Amino acid sequence: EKRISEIEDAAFLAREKAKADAEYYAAHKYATSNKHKLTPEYLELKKYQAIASNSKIYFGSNIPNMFVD
């Protein structure tokens, strides 16, 4: 069983090394792609969506000075 565990560890490094290398490439490509996609207007649109998502609004000149929930 000790020998089998040694073989398991030998096979474990390669699997984790492959994932690290694969993850690095995806992040690297995902980085040079954002150099174009993240213009100020795109960031503004994403800001609109994120701020307005799942939000309640109490707008009006004479907002009351009370609240309970």
């Binding site: 800001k47 609109y48 701020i51 307005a52 799942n54 939000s55 309640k56 609004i57 109490y58 707008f59 009006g60 000149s61 907002i63």
Partner: peptide, 16 residues
């Protein structure tokens, strides 16, 4: 995250 807003008008929501 759940949010609530208070302000004079809608456009002020996105201003920072």
């Amino acid at each position: 995250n759940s949010k609530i807003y208070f302000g004079k008008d809608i456009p002020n929501m996105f201003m920072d």
